[PDB]
Amino acid sequence: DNLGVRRAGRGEIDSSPSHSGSPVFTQAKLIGLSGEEQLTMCQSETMALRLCMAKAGKETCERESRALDSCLGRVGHLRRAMSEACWEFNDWFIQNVSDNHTKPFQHRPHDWRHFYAQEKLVRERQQNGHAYGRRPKQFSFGARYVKTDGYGKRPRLPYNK
Amino acid sequence: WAKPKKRPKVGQGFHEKAQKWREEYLLDRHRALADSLRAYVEFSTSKRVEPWDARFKPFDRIEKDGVYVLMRYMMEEKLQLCNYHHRPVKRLFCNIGLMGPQITTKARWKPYRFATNPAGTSKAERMYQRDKTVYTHGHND
Amino acid sequence: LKIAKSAFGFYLARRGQRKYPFLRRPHIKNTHSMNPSAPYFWSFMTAKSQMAFLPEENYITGDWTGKFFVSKRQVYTLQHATSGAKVRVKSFPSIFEFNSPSRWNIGKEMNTLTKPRMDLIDEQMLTKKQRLDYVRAGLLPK
Amino acid sequence: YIERXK
Amino acid sequence: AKRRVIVPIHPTPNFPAHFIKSAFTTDPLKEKQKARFSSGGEAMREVQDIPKNLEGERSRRDLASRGDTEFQALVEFIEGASYDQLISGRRFKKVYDVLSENDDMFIWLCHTAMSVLNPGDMRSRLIYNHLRILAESVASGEMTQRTAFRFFESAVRSPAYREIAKRQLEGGAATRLAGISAAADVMRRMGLTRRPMSSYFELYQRIVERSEAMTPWGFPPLFQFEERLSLEPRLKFFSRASGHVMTPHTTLHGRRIFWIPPTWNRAGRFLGPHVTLYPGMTP
Amino acid sequence: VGYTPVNPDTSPMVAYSQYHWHYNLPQGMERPHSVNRTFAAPFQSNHS
Amino acid sequence: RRGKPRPRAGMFPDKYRRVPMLLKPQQGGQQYFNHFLIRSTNDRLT
Amino acid sequence: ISYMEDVGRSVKNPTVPGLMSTKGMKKKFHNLYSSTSTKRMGFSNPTLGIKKV
Amino acid sequence: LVRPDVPEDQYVDSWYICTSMTHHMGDYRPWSASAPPNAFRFRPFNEFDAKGREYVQY
Amino acid sequence: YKMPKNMGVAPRFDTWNEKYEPWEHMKRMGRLVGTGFYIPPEWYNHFRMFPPINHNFQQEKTLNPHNASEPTQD
RNA sequence: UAUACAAUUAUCAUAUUAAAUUGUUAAGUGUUGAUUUAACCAAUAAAAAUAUAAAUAAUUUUUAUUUGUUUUUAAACACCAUUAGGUAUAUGCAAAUAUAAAAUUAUAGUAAUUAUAAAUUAUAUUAUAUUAUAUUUAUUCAUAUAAUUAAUAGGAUAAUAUUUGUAGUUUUUGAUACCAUGAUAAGGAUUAUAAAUUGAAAGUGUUAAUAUCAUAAUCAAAAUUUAUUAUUUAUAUUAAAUAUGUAUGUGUAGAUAAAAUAAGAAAUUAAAAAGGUAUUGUUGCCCACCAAUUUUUAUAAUAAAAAUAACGUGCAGUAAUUAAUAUAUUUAUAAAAAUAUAUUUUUUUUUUUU
């Protein structure tokens, strides 16, 4: 039954939705659950409590620890919410955006070769329609200042060799 | 399941070698046996250390009082007759009856291999210093 | 079996190192039959009573042409020493012989006077591999 | 890896 | 290479021809493959889905006495609560398939109601007859949903249509009531459902569920309708469907309905599904 | 299958097959047998 | 098991899988409920 | 949480470092146990096993 | 449920198959036919359970 | 050489519409019925006299986004 | 033997309407020394930033002009060789993919083709769809022997059988010590808790069609070399089938074993993206040198090219054990390798002023 849907179930091999042909494997990384850059709920809390803990041992603060674990207690349902919404996104995306791995990759430079060609063409017509894909010869670190008069001190256009 | 590989031939002159080896193994075993029987009976006759543990009671008590009194005046001849081997010592203490029920329950005796040491033994190393060429089952001095 | 030391090596499987019910192993090989005991000398590997008669094999049961070896359970009798006759027992490789009579033998079985596992090891019956392994055990010199 | 063909 | 030589077996009083060719193969690279499946009368009549033909008197008699199949399916599912039977997922499947026999027809109609900005006035007999005819052609398979939809929007309405639409609509989105009352009306006057309400209810329900979806009334052109590649049945648009270490070796070990129950050759230690090994005490 | 034929009395796979009586059928006697009543054989011992 | 890593704990069926939910934990002290109810109502009136 | 009490905190790191040195021990990952490849057909993908350095 | 829910005296564990069968093939009697008419928790008698019957008797 | 996964079954992104376009079925069914040897489906009995709109063309053959292709969906 | 390219879009060598060319900046000394590298060895180390407008379109430049090779190291990096040095980047020469073409190879007579891209190929740290691997206890592991497998035959209390005592050698050959097909084991890796099992098909001596060396079988009392086995560790110790004499050494090397189930353990992780010159597919295929031969010729250390199935060296290629491809220069048992450029017919990892 998994033919004609060339994407298979979910959490499953070949379930991944595609965007301009390269599949989407970063979903969690988006909603900021489980990422190195991940969204952080409570900071001021833990820094406040750490501050207290480091200051002195005479007075003890459960006054902070309560604020903090109140915070975490909420954080749980917040996360289940975000995860839920994101699964909804995976579905919406699959319906209305993804091409199901049908269209050519856009994400590697050679896939844009035509574009680059357009600019090579330009640099050639500037050269009297001649040197295609040619570039100025690299010179030396000290190129300008080590060369005597009569020799080119700066790299020329390639047709101007 | 591999087909079993056939066993190689016996050897030559091995039948005489084996006959000889077993033969003189037995003629040796005769002096082994003789020596060990001497050692065993010699052990049986000679004196041993006291089989009871003086770290528990009714034994820890001063040798001028309690059990030892019962031992000095009433039991002495009997204990010296059996050379303090732990089996008849314990049995005599059973039969004297003035300790009566305690011999097994309350009282405590040295482990088998320690109680076997010769009279006048000083250091524990004496357990491993007994002759090893003799077959008495740890029953030799 | 790996090596066939007999007929049965063809028929039998070893089945690893396998446990048998107490005191029943299919092939009785008494490695312990000669196992020196001074104090236990009369009670060990011998008649459970001193009041029993000698076994069947201490007597000629019928008209015999004659025998090669007497069975190993035949007890050594004073006549075994005195008479000066061939006393043969089937051991390995071939046969053991009571040649040099002594009175220290009397009243024990030749099951007891014959060492089943000898310390003498022929290298002619061993594979090169086997010899290697016995060298591992620190039995054979090399 | 080199020998893999045997 | 010591190739295995299999002797062919000839048909026998108890070993008939087709049995031989099905259960025995002389090419021993084909041994130990897997199990093969076949069907006889009823499972074949289900699988092959050969639509019957109308015929002489018996077939018409059987059309007459037919009665309500939708209720029959339900009775037969329900009857699994009788003491002498079980509750069958197959009986339920047959139930389901008769409830949803039309299904996609409704789906099509949703699109005509909700997927089209300004489909004229849907009360007027003209556009109404367009809708009616196309619907009856989506049912009875005479047309593809795609073709019927593209027909519906390209159907002839009225001269200078857009310029008349500028006299009513700003951004060209009409009101959707006329459309739904129409699309329920068609299914009622066409005989589409056995029980009258079902038309209206399904059409309404399917809309109300989609109302909550992001960009609800637009659809990708390829997935909207029948096309080579499709969406998985949960994501289709107006659709009705919107130990642990030892478990692979366990398999059979739960409470398991079987097809062919295992046999002693093919399963070594399994005791049967009914068995309760750690029984509790009950009065 | 083998050189030793299955003895059909002991073997369930014979007994309970379609060509004999399975254990879930009702286990009664199939037909009566009068052998010794129909034709009777007079006694002649092989020993005098 | 054999020359392989032991599974993670959650890869096994539940340790207490055969012990009914009412048992873990036991709810005991049912005797005191009524007492603490009457107590709290009397309190309220005060 | 059973047994709550008001007692003061202790000093940070009251424990004296153990007699087994964890530092001089090298952490092993991939070759640690022995695995069996589920690879059905074809050359095993070189990027995973061998490719970097 | 794997098999119809009925008193297990109607079931026999099959030989060679892992499954059970009815020793009267295909027929079934409901629990109501095992006990006397209108038996509370179908029972030989309504007074007590098994253990209760036994120790009362004792 | 690596490709996007489903390219084998990738649809023709220009022409996949043609097959389903109403005019097509109008013409085909037109010369099918004409034979005398086919029974016209009823949709054809209907759109026979209300043939579909002329100048709506897809965005595939006409490459313009700004073209408002539809009198309806505009 | 003769017998009908394209002209709307075709990648290796016959270019052509074009604005360039020229710019004098930077960087350098305090002191007693393990920098760089997966790893060696020579031995001061810092550094070289600026330009737009403008040049008109086409019709006789094709012997003209033009497509990354460049003086000066007394300046370095870098690269090549290894402590000695070489070299260290557009003033000589140097047309050349950006496509005008007619099946592959081949200097334009050789072989009969070649080339090609989407099927298929298990591991690249994703959210707890709803709960835990970092705990416990273990590791001295041995046992087989003394040859004949070939058919029936009934008894006391029964109407009579010496059938008491039933007598016809000799033409066949496989399960054997021996080649002689089948078939059932072991092996935990994601269908979960409710009225419920923590053991699987992919085959472990004995089993049914290949015959053409031989009697090898326990009924006692017996000979250690075999990967695949939980033994009793200090108060008392051999009586019935005969029953194990050796190893006290700081609970001590390496390396190993078992378990989440009527027992008692609790928070760290795991699902989703991927290539094949093979084609039941890596035990897959291929690459060059290195012999014979065969055949055409435009004979360069040792001619060139094409067929080809030995021998020997390797392991060049299939993202393939330092990714490949093209040009360039160098290097060389042989595939090829080093460096300089371009490049993906190589696999991807992603800051819209922080």
Ligand SMILES: [Mg+2]
């Ligand atoms: Mg590739």
Ligand SMILES: [Mg+2]
């Ligand atoms: Mg693919």
Ligand SMILES: [Mg+2]
């Ligand atoms: Mg050209």
Ligand SMILES: [Mg+2]
């Ligand atoms: Mg087999």
Ligand SMILES: [Mg+2]
């Ligand atoms: Mg020639």
Ligand SMILES: [Mg+2]
């Ligand atoms: Mg040549």
Ligand SMILES: [Mg+2]
């Ligand atoms: Mg290479």
Ligand SMILES: [Mg+2]
């Ligand atoms: Mg290679």
Ligand SMILES: [Mg+2]
């Ligand atoms: Mg390579």
Ligand SMILES: [Mg+2]
């Ligand atoms: Mg190359």
Ligand SMILES: [Mg+2]
């Ligand atoms: Mg080159």
Ligand SMILES: [Mg+2]
């Ligand atoms: Mg080379």
Ligand SMILES: [Mg+2]
């Ligand atoms: Mg090269």
